[PDB]
Motif scaffolding. Structure first.
Motif, PDB file in Angstrom:
ATOM      1  N   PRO A   1      11.928 -54.814  29.451  1.00  9.67           N
ATOM      2  CA  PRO A   1      11.935 -53.641  28.567  1.00  9.67           C
ATOM      3  C   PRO A   1      11.277 -53.809  27.194  1.00  9.67           C
ATOM      4  O   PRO A   1      10.813 -52.810  26.666  1.00  9.67           O
ATOM      5  CB  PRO A   1      13.424 -53.329  28.315  1.00  9.67           C
ATOM      6  N   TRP A   2      11.266 -55.020  26.643  1.00 11.69           N
ATOM      7  CA  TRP A   2      10.719 -55.230  25.273  1.00 11.69           C
ATOM      8  C   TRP A   2       9.188 -55.289  25.347  1.00 11.69           C
ATOM      9  O   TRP A   2       8.555 -54.833  24.386  1.00 11.69           O
ATOM     10  CB  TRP A   2      11.389 -56.378  24.543  1.00 11.69           C
TER      11      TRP A   2
ATOM     12  N   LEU B   1       5.919 -43.522   8.725  1.00 15.45           N
ATOM     13  CA  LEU B   1       5.112 -44.198   9.778  1.00 15.45           C
ATOM     14  C   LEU B   1       5.885 -45.419  10.290  1.00 15.45           C
ATOM     15  O   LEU B   1       5.806 -45.655  11.510  1.00 15.45           O
ATOM     16  CB  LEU B   1       3.716 -44.551   9.250  1.00 15.45           C
TER      17      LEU B   1
ATOM     18  N   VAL C   1      -2.205 -42.970  15.780  1.00 16.69           N
ATOM     19  CA  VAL C   1      -2.294 -42.728  14.310  1.00 16.69           C
ATOM     20  C   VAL C   1      -3.716 -43.088  13.859  1.00 16.69           C
ATOM     21  O   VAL C   1      -4.233 -42.399  12.968  1.00 16.69           O
ATOM     22  CB  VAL C   1      -1.189 -43.467  13.524  1.00 16.69           C
TER      23      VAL C   1
ATOM     24  N   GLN D   1       7.719 -53.267  27.320  1.00 16.94           N
ATOM     25  CA  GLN D   1       7.517 -51.799  27.478  1.00 16.94           C
ATOM     26  C   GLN D   1       7.581 -51.162  26.087  1.00 16.94           C
ATOM     27  O   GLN D   1       6.763 -50.267  25.818  1.00 16.94           O
ATOM     28  CB  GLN D   1       8.523 -51.212  28.469  1.00 16.94           C
ATOM     29  N   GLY D   2       8.484 -51.628  25.230  1.00 12.51           N
ATOM     30  CA  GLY D   2       8.577 -51.161  23.830  1.00 12.51           C
ATOM     31  C   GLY D   2       7.347 -51.485  23.000  1.00 12.51           C
ATOM     32  O   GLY D   2       6.897 -50.604  22.234  1.00 12.51           O
ATOM     33  N   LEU D   3       6.842 -52.707  23.114  1.00  4.83           N
ATOM     34  CA  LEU D   3       5.652 -53.133  22.335  1.00  4.83           C
ATOM     35  C   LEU D   3       4.425 -52.362  22.823  1.00  4.83           C
ATOM     36  O   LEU D   3       3.588 -52.021  21.976  1.00  4.83           O
ATOM     37  CB  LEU D   3       5.433 -54.648  22.439  1.00  4.83           C
TER      38      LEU D   3
ATOM     39  N   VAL E   1       9.559 -45.111  18.396  1.00  4.97           N
ATOM     40  CA  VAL E   1       8.659 -45.230  19.563  1.00  4.97           C
ATOM     41  C   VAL E   1       9.022 -46.520  20.251  1.00  4.97           C
ATOM     42  O   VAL E   1       8.844 -46.532  21.487  1.00  4.97           O
ATOM     43  CB  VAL E   1       7.178 -45.195  19.144  1.00  4.97           C
ATOM     44  N   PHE E   2       9.457 -47.563  19.536  1.00  7.68           N
ATOM     45  CA  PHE E   2       9.710 -48.840  20.259  1.00  7.68           C
ATOM     46  C   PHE E   2      10.999 -48.645  21.038  1.00  7.68           C
ATOM     47  O   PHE E   2      11.015 -49.122  22.203  1.00  7.68           O
ATOM     48  CB  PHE E   2       9.772 -50.061  19.358  1.00  7.68           C
ATOM     49  N   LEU E   3      11.994 -47.980  20.418  1.00  8.39           N
ATOM     50  CA  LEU E   3      13.291 -47.685  21.076  1.00  8.39           C
ATOM     51  C   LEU E   3      13.027 -46.764  22.274  1.00  8.39           C
ATOM     52  O   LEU E   3      13.686 -46.942  23.290  1.00  8.39           O
ATOM     53  CB  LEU E   3      14.275 -47.026  20.116  1.00  8.39           C
ATOM     54  N   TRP E   4      12.101 -45.822  22.166  1.00  2.51           N
ATOM     55  CA  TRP E   4      11.701 -45.000  23.328  1.00  2.51           C
ATOM     56  C   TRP E   4      11.044 -45.855  24.397  1.00  2.51           C
ATOM     57  O   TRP E   4      11.424 -45.685  25.558  1.00  2.51           O
ATOM     58  CB  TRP E   4      10.789 -43.868  22.912  1.00  2.51           C
ATOM     59  N   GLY E   5      10.094 -46.699  24.042  1.00  5.75           N
ATOM     60  CA  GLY E   5       9.416 -47.569  25.021  1.00  5.75           C
ATOM     61  C   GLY E   5      10.367 -48.495  25.775  1.00  5.75           C
ATOM     62  O   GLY E   5      10.122 -48.780  26.971  1.00  5.75           O
ATOM     63  N   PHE E   6      11.410 -48.950  25.110  1.00  6.46           N
ATOM     64  CA  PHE E   6      12.437 -49.839  25.699  1.00  6.46           C
ATOM     65  C   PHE E   6      13.252 -49.164  26.830  1.00  6.46           C
ATOM     66  O   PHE E   6      13.653 -49.773  27.809  1.00  6.46           O
ATOM     67  CB  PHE E   6      13.365 -50.228  24.572  1.00  6.46           C
TER      68      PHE E   6
ATOM     69  N   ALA F   1       4.518 -49.287  23.867  1.00  2.05           N
ATOM     70  CA  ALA F   1       4.706 -47.904  23.379  1.00  2.05           C
ATOM     71  C   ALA F   1       4.267 -47.818  21.934  1.00  2.05           C
ATOM     72  O   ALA F   1       3.514 -46.867  21.611  1.00  2.05           O
ATOM     73  CB  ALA F   1       6.138 -47.468  23.486  1.00  2.05           C
ATOM     74  N   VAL F   2       4.724 -48.757  21.106  1.00  2.00           N
ATOM     75  CA  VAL F   2       4.339 -48.764  19.663  1.00  2.00           C
ATOM     76  C   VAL F   2       2.842 -49.069  19.535  1.00  2.00           C
ATOM     77  O   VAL F   2       2.257 -48.523  18.615  1.00  2.00           O
ATOM     78  CB  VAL F   2       5.180 -49.719  18.804  1.00  2.00           C
TER      79      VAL F   2
ATOM     80  N   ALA G   1       7.263 -45.708  14.172  1.00  2.00           N
ATOM     81  CA  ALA G   1       6.993 -46.896  15.011  1.00  2.00           C
ATOM     82  C   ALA G   1       8.309 -47.446  15.585  1.00  2.00           C
ATOM     83  O   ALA G   1       8.307 -47.832  16.753  1.00  2.00           O
ATOM     84  CB  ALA G   1       6.243 -47.946  14.241  1.00  2.00           C
TER      85      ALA G   1
ATOM     86  N   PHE H   1       1.030 -45.934  20.064  1.00  2.00           N
ATOM     87  CA  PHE H   1       1.323 -44.974  18.960  1.00  2.00           C
ATOM     88  C   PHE H   1       0.478 -45.325  17.742  1.00  2.00           C
ATOM     89  O   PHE H   1      -0.018 -44.386  17.097  1.00  2.00           O
ATOM     90  CB  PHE H   1       2.798 -44.964  18.571  1.00  2.00           C
ATOM     91  N   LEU H   2       0.339 -46.615  17.430  1.00  3.80           N
ATOM     92  CA  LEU H   2      -0.494 -47.042  16.276  1.00  3.80           C
ATOM     93  C   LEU H   2      -1.947 -46.647  16.540  1.00  3.80           C
ATOM     94  O   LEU H   2      -2.589 -46.226  15.581  1.00  3.80           O
ATOM     95  CB  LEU H   2      -0.347 -48.545  16.017  1.00  3.80           C
TER      96      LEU H   2
END
Ligand SMILES: O=C(CCc1ccc(O)cc1)c1c(O)cc(O)cc1O[C@@H]1O[C@H](CO)[C@@H](O)[C@H](O)[C@H]1O
Ligand SMILES: CC(=O)N[C@@H]1[C@@H](O)[C@H](O)[C@@H](CO)O[C@H]1O
Lengths: 29, 588
Positions: free
Chosen positions: A2-3, B574, A17, A5-7, B581-586, A9-10, B578, A13-14
């Motif tokens: 899952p982590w 911002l 932006v 998957q989190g990295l 979004v990381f909590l969503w990605g998890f 996602a961010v 971020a 997103f970056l």
């Protein structure tokens, strides 16, 4: 994992932006 | 008629009685006692608590128990929308000189028609969405605590509500609202702690939910038959935020593009949201509070949704009951039963003393929330709509019609109460968000076109609005009327209509009414540019005097910021996004 998957996602997103800031700098002077 | 039930040991009786004596205490004190100035932190925290109401606990936990984690999606859309209040919808009410979106649409288009229509729409969305949902949430809490029918429970929630209003009440709000919210979030944190203890940690919740299904899967009534394992066993994906676009309960496409249409309308146009939002000393203060309120949109996922799931694991024979006979026996409605998840969890986990505090505070909140919304619907009705019909008012006379309105909407909400009970398979969340997907997206289209297309004239807005109500009602009425039924006994209305997710119909009603607005607009005369300044985005930095459209019917205006503090606030938004979004990605 899952982590991973989190990295992912961010990271997306970056990039999102960066597309927005490129639009504001280049197409919205 | 109450004995050896987990509320009937007098630790909790003393605690409940003490708190509803202390609230009347603050109130009679208040009776005899008698835009700027609120700072980043307090005005962020008011946005948060503006949306933490027993109706939220009920529904968001309930749908947690039913569907897994993806109602938490709801909340994490909220923080992106609150940011866009803080950046888009908050400057506009500051530049225009308005507070309400009715005040904005009076300055922007001009006629008495759009004020009239939104006013009547707001009456229907307090009867459908606020009053009936709050009455229902009280009924549920009360049933799980002291077995009682829905009808008897609302008799009581309205009895205590009337003696809240007449003994101070809404006068002594700031004191009561601060203390209710402190101890709701306190109570919620303690009870979450207890829920995760009882299931055996975080690892416990995750290793135990996907098997938490009921043992009673057969009905005396044939026709129902041997109930399928599709329906009673939990959804195979229920640890994930992002679901299938077409066969998901809460499709990804839908959540993103379609909650924004509906959550947007809630944060842009609510009375309480905008009234608490415009208390900053500044746009920087507004923006920085709107950043802190995002950091408070991830607490609910733990505090509200995961406890619904632990309510399914701990109590599956009640919370996750499938059979039409057994459901009615436990929650009072054939269609389902998840709605009891959070109240059953409060009654049966929180120990003696604390239990009563948490029931007292979740009940004093529905007292406050009902009293708030009765007052608000009364002003709106008494002013907008009666005055129009009869502008000959004895203010005594008006105060009658003000009081007689509240009688009518108590009665129509109580009439509606069994539709709210078995609304979307017995899922209060889904009913709230489904009513708001049928009625909001027209108004969403007219406010996002008002504010970014200056060509849109008044004829446009009005018929956009009225052409969106007819499409929307061509699904809201047809659905609450052909029944919605549930997993076991599927509905009856056809899928030429109620197949597609309600959030996808919100997307289509948004774009449809939008095009009605654009097309009626471009076939009529335009609004001249001179009476459009600091109303459209194209004319917000204009510094040109305008001759207002409401001024035709009549015969805190700063967005300055310190650029050092503005760089600080844009950085913090911002970083927060971020983190979000990381909590969503998890949890995707
Ligand atoms: O409940 C509050 C919290 C007050 C508060 C203020 C400062 C603080 O540090 C902590 C709490 C509140 C608010 O801050 C702004 C509002 O405008 C209305 C509020 O009250 C109720 O909030 C309910 C949900 O909790 C809502 O359903 C109800 O209708 C509404 O009257
Ligand atoms: C999985 C399954 O077949 N379950 C039951 C079966 O045990 C029972 O013999 C039958 C009689 O009505 O109904 C069905």
């Amino acid at each position: 994992q899952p982590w991973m998957q989190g990295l992912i996602a961010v990271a997306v997103f970056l990039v999102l932006v960066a597309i927005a800031f490129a639009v504001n700098h280049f197409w919205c002077q | 008629g109450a004995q050896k039930a987990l509320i009937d040991n007098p630790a909790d009786i003393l605690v409940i009685a003490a708190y509803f004596l202390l609230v009347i205490g603050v109130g009679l004190w208040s009776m005899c006692r008698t835009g700027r100035s609120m700072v980043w932190w307090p005005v962020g925290a008011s946005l948060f608590a503006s949306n933490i109401g027993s109706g939220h606990f009920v529904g968001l936990a309930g749908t947690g128990a039913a569907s897994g984690l993806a109602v938490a999606g709801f909340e994490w859309n909220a923080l992106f929308v609150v940011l866009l209040l803080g950046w888009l919808f908050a400057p506009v009410y500051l530049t225009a000189g308005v507070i309400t979106m009715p005040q904005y649409l009076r300055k922007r288009f001009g006629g008495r028609r759009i004020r009239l229509y939104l006013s009547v729409l707001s009456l229907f969305l307090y009867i459908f969405t606020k009053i009936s949902v709050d009455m229902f949430s009280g009924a549920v809490f009360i049933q799980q605590a002291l077995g009682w029918n829905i009808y008897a429970s609302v008799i009581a929630l309205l009895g205590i509500t009337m003696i809240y209003t007449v003994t101070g009440g809404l006068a002594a709000l700031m004191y009561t609202d601060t203390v209710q919210t402190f101890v709701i979030l306190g109570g919620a944190c303690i009870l979450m702690g207890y829920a995760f203890h009882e299931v055996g940690g975080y690892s416990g919740l995750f290793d135990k939910y996907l098997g938490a299904a009921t043992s009673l899967t057969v009905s005396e009534d044939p026709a129902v038959g041997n109930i399928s394992s599709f329906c009673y066993r939990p959804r195979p994906d229920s640890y994930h935020l992002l679901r299938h676009p077409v066969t998901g309960d809460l499709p990804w496409p839908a959540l993103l593009l379609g909650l924004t249409i509906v959550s947007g309308w809630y944060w842009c146009s609510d009375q309480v949201i905008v009234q608490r939002c415009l208390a900053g000393k500044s746009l920087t203060h507004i923006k920085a509070g709107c950043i802190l309120c995002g950091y408070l949109k991830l607490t609910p996922m733990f505090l509200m949704v995961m406890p619904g799931m632990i309510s399914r694991i701990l109590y599956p024979d009640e919370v996750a009951c499938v059979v039409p006979e057994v459901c009615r026996r436990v929650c009072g409605t054939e269609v389902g039963c998840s709605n009891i998840a959070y109240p059953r969890l409060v009654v049966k986990l929180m120990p003696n003393g604390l239990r009563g505090l948490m029931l007292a505070v979740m009940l004093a909140a529905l007292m406050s929330s009902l009293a708030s919304i009765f007052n608000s619907s009364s002003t709106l009705f008494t002013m907008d709509i009666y005055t129009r019909l009869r502008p000959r008012a004895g203010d005594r006379e008006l105060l009658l019609v003000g009081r007689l309105w509240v009688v009518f909407i108590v009665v129509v909400s109580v009439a509606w109460l069994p539709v709210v009970q078995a609304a979307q398979g017995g899922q209060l969340f889904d009913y709230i968000q489904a009513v708001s997907s049928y009625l909001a997206p027209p108004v969403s289209a007219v406010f996002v076109l008002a504010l970014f297309v200056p060509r849109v004239n008044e004829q446009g807005a009005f018929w956009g609005l009225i052409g969106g109500l007819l499409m929307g009602l061509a699904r809201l009425i047809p659905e609450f009327s052909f029944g919605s039924g549930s997993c076991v006994q599927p509905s009856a209305c056809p899928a030429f209509l109620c197949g597609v997710h309600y959030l996808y119909f919100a997307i289509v009603l948004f774009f449809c009414s939008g095009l009605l607005t654009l097309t009626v607009s471009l076939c009529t005369a335009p609004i001249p540019r001179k009476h459009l300044h600091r109303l459209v985005f194209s004319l917000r930095h204009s510094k040109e005097e305008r001759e207002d459209l409401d001024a035709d019917e009549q015969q805190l205006e700063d967005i300055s910021e310190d650029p050092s503090w503005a760089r600080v606030v844009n950085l913090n938004a911002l970083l927060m996004m971020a983190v979000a979004v990381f909590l969503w990605g998890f949890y995707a």
